Amino acid sequence: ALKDPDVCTDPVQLTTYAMGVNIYKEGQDVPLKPDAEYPEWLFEMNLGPPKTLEELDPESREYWRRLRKQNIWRHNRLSKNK
Amino acid sequence: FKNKTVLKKRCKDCYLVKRRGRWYVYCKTHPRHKQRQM
Amino acid sequence: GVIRAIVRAGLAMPGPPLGPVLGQRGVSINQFCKEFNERTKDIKEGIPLPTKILVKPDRTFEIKIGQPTVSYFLKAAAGIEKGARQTGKEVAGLVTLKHVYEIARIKAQDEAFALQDVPLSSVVRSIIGSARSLGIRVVKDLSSEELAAFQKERAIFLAAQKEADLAAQEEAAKK
Amino acid sequence: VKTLLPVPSFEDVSIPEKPKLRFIERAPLVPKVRREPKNLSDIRGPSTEATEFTEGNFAILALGGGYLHWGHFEMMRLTINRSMDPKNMFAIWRVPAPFKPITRKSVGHRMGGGKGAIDHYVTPVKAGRLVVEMGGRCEFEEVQGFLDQVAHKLPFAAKAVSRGTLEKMRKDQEERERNNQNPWTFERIATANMLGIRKVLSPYDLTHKGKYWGKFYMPKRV
Amino acid sequence: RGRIPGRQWIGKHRRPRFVSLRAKQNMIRRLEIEAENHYWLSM
Amino acid sequence: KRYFVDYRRVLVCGGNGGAGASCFHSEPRKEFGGPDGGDGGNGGHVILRVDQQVKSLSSVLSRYQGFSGEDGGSKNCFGRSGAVLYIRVPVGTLVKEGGRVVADLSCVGDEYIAALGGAGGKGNRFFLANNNRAPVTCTPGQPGQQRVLHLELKTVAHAGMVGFPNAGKSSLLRAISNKPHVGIVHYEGHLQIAVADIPGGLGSAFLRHIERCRFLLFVVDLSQPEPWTQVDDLKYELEMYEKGLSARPHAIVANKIDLPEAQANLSQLRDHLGQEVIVLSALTGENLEQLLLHLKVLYDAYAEAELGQGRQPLRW
Amino acid sequence: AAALARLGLRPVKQVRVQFCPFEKNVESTRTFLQTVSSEKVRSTNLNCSVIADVRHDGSEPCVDVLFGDGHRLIMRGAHLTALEMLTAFASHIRARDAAGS
Amino acid sequence: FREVVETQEGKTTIIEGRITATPKESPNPPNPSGQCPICRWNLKHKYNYDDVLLLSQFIRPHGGMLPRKITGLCQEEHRKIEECVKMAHRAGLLPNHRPRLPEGVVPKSKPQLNRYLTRWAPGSVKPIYKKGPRWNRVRMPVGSPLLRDNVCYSRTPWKLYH
Amino acid sequence: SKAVTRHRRVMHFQRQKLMAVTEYIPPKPAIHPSCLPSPPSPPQEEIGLIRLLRREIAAVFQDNRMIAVCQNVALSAEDKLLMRHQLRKHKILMKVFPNQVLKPFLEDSKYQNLLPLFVGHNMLLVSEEPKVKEMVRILRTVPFLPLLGGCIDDTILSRQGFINYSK
RNA sequence: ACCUCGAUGUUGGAUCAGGACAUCCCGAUGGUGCAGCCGCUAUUAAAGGUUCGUUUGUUCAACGAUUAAAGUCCUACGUGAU
RNA sequence: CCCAUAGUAGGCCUAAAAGCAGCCACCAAUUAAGAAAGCGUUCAAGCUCAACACAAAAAAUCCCAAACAUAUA
Ligand SMILES: Nc1nc2c(ncn2[C@@H]2O[C@H](COP(=O)(O)OP(=O)(O)O)[C@@H](O)[C@H]2O)c(=O)[nH]1
Ligand code: FES
Ligand SMILES: [K+]
């Protein structure tokens, strides 16, 4: 019975306006802003697969987050058989 | 009490104890986990 | 106790799934449905709204409403109705980084992000990996010239799933 | 701060198309019409084949002689396939299918009457031979749990090992011979016929050097 | 109690025999004498 | 976690008969005694015996294994038959294999076979004859029957307590007695009438189990904003499963009146006045004797209906 | 933490812990306050409060426990370990609860 | 050492920790290069259960064994001393380290049986009804296996089973 | 019997004597290695996380001038995050660093007298602007949260010094 | 196929039994899908007890009525110069 | 030993199956936490962990030498 709200299928409308941003019925669709208005940190993020352990700088928190996560993966596999 | 040649704890509450010459497994949470060394 | 669940906006039902859950705690089911619908009237009906329920010892409840799930924001922005069956071997949707910034600007106002007081840079970074689960691929620059081809080919692939899905049902009937 | 160390990645490891062990039949396709002598010397002494790893890294090392019949294969095959991960593990057979015929007479058999009819087939195994070899995207601790369970049900004394453990085991025995403070060894006395000891020894004892007695292998003998 | 089936020192189930301390010393003493015999036969 | 005993799936394994010895006898003089293997003993049977003492099917064992008959020995020694196994079941228990109604139990003392024990294999001496001087064949013991039993006991519920949860059905059950829960009401004249409720729509599984009742009691909370709406939904769900269950006599009961004292909601039920309703508080035990006296009279009509059915009216 | 939560601060009325952080003999006293101020222990008895007053008077650390019956328990943590203080404190919890009931 | 005393005045309980005199190690150890106090004094393999002077320095006033990390002993000698302490109480050589008896308890009169070199607790030993054959005799343990390497001045080694 | 038997066949007495005499004898050192002074352990290279914390810790003492040392009590995560949200409103950070990393930094540094404070679970309340008055009222919500002390403008102050500075 | 072929026929019963405990009953004690009665299972316990009949040469078994129970065995498959 | 809040009931498929019916991918807020290694739920809830900090034995007349860890082989 319960279903997700119907979403419009129009390439022109999707590019011009973001449908999911507006949630109020009496509200209006929020138009997307041009590239220059958005900040610099938005268009330099890792869109693809995560960087491997070797590619990260050792003197960084994200490098040790990856190593700590892999240790948790190693510990879980050992405990699986036990 | 179930006699076992090898005594294995069946949960985190089981604890080994040396009494009367043979090891015993006591578990107050699960009374069926009690074992006696054979 | 505290119970958290996702409830469709303005479509709360006295029956399952939250019905039996409230019955155990003793919370009045009809009062919850009335309060939720009267509070979610402004929001469009059917929107998945994660709800947090606070239960008092005297069977008194005070509903709490948070921001909609990121999946609704991502799917609506790309026009996709349903997520992909497989991830990485196929592309379900296609959104821009501008879509993520417009989505994160409101999703970061929820209770969880507000209490942490983290910058929007970390909020956008958490949505990029969320779209990966749904199969949506994010491109820095996108135009309607290349979006219309991908969406046209997506429907072709979706029709292929319909052929496979109907084939499985027909085989099940023969069993 | 808890110490953090890099862990090996098995991404380069590849898995065959049939990780599970192939089914083992009771008897070979071609029956043996002619019966064979018992030849108990085929399980006596060290193994001269299948003593090194081929594809995997972990294997069940046999520390004694014995015969494997169809029942033994089923226990190993069912246990390993169920308890292992097909995605990241694979196993192969390091022993052939049952081929040596075993003749058993009907109940009530008195002495005589010639050789009995063929009853079942077995696979003789010598000490130091690898029975089942495993490998893939898995550590030694992951597989040691059920491999010792499989090795425990073998008719002979066995123990799961790896490339490093087996190498360390061999190096330890070599170390024991070098630093042994006993001036008298089995090899020296047996070869030189000291005290006329060869009257109570066997011709195989010149090569076994006291480490093998019947089908039993003694790792503590230097 | 303590019956050994059949005869003591023959058969499948024989009475176990153990090496005493002086038994080891006697064999070692024999070995030393013969080890010296190997030396005088080498020249 | 204590519950009233209801349909429970039990496993019965009959005894397997023993095989023959298949041996030959020898004596110093004759030196050819002939066959002397004795027949194997027959396996025990599993019998469901009705007992009036056990009102409830409390004795529910995980599995039932009959004693296998001993195999025959030398000198024509017949094997001992396996000891029979008896299971205690209340009167009126329905035993089925999940596909059909196998049998029904009439009264105390009735015994029904649910697992045949295996027969005993004949020894080699059974085949001895003038033409067959030295038979050697033996008969293997037939294995005993092992089947899955779907023991279904008609719950003894002269009254059925139905309603949406949090209304107080279990609390009321505790008061009068002082996943189905069953209690007993003891009244004057040594008359005992039982009442059942299932604390958790309500589901088809609940309706089928509550179908095995004689009277239905509807419980509606006084704090409910629309007590009449709750009445219709429970009735409609029951009516959807079966219109006949609605024809059964009912009694609308308002609960939780002690603390709320919602007299406005009380007048609403009286305004509708579909039938004579009863207003009581389970927590404080107010006006319980009023309904309990009426409930006993209601079952009296069912005893007359039991005469038309011909089945015993459950000891009362 | 877990050991004291199983017992509960049912008869406890108020807990006051004072220490001088700059001194080098308040390690157990601070760790004792760590266990008492835990959510599991405090959730058992909401009425009971925990008081922590930091002073720079160079005085010895002491722990004051106020019970409903009116008796007081004073533990000087300068020369007592956290386990010793917890064991002594938890022992009085069982004694006072039995006397009250 | 450290002592704890509780004094109650005016229904108020006060717990205090007072430091007492602490004994000091004797100066000029014979072997300063040792790691644990045993070999620092060349006492390795040179003490027995009857040397209560050595054992009293590693026990509590109630006869309990002291922790290894406090006394500083090695794992090997701590177990050897632990077994010698157990055999010392059983032999009656430590009358001043008896267990603390709670108030209102009077021990019953029990058979005073002299014993020594008792490996196991007396209450946990079953009698040997069937000795068995000569080649499979059930021997009675005497002493402790952990003292197998002690300096023996006799040609016959210690007999640990009778 | 056969040369190879399923059971352990009993050896001839002469062979059994030969086996007993020719048994492995491990070498026995004159002095047990454990009793002799062990050689110094090989140097342990510092973990990149540890050298990352030192750079981050040194920035805290240099960038922000007000540092408040408190005991991170075992508060519930909901209540511990809520106070951090209150501190973030007044631009007050709640940084936590291990003692085994922070102590060596303060051993040879200007803030050498803050060493005895860091014993156990500790947390640092830091801000570029010393909003002591706004911070104190946040901490007064929980009477069981102790304010150990701090150092404002390179001057070490106790809890009472913050109270006087706040007023 | 080792002992007995220069006087034990074997089976069963009667008589009287000694012994093992791997306990059928009585006793003590854990677990239980042990509410209570009944049960199941395990540890401990051999001091005491362990029926009478029909057909059958019977041992055994079938069923007849009982009993707290109608134990498994060994003893020259106990005992036949009783 | 202590501890555990969060982008979320990750999507697919499923009456709903949420870290734990199955499966595709396994990123990520935060000092520090598995798109979950086990239990418990029709499904949820609840729980732990990973994270920060601090090696046996029993048969039938009645067990079976007596015993003894310490004086130089
Ligand atoms: N005040 C009041 N409370 C009641 C009464 N009956 C039940 N309750 C409440 O209902 C709770 C139990 O509900 P329950 O029996 O499980 O409802 P059911 O699921 O419909 O059977 C208890 O906590 C009681 O406080 C009543 O007559 N008066
Ligand atoms: S380290 Fe030398 S005896 Fe303890
Ligand atoms: K004669």
Ligand SMILES: [Mg+2]
């Ligand atoms: Mg003999």
Ligand SMILES: [Mg+2]
């Ligand atoms: Mg209920």
Ligand SMILES: [Mg+2]
């Ligand atoms: Mg031969």
Ligand SMILES: [Mg+2]
């Ligand atoms: Mg017994």
Ligand SMILES: [Mg+2]
């Ligand atoms: Mg006879």
Ligand SMILES: [Mg+2]
């Ligand atoms: Mg006779």
Ligand SMILES: [Mg+2]
């Ligand atoms: Mg006679």
Ligand SMILES: [Mg+2]
């Ligand atoms: Mg942990």
Ligand SMILES: [Zn+2]
């Ligand atoms: Zn347990």
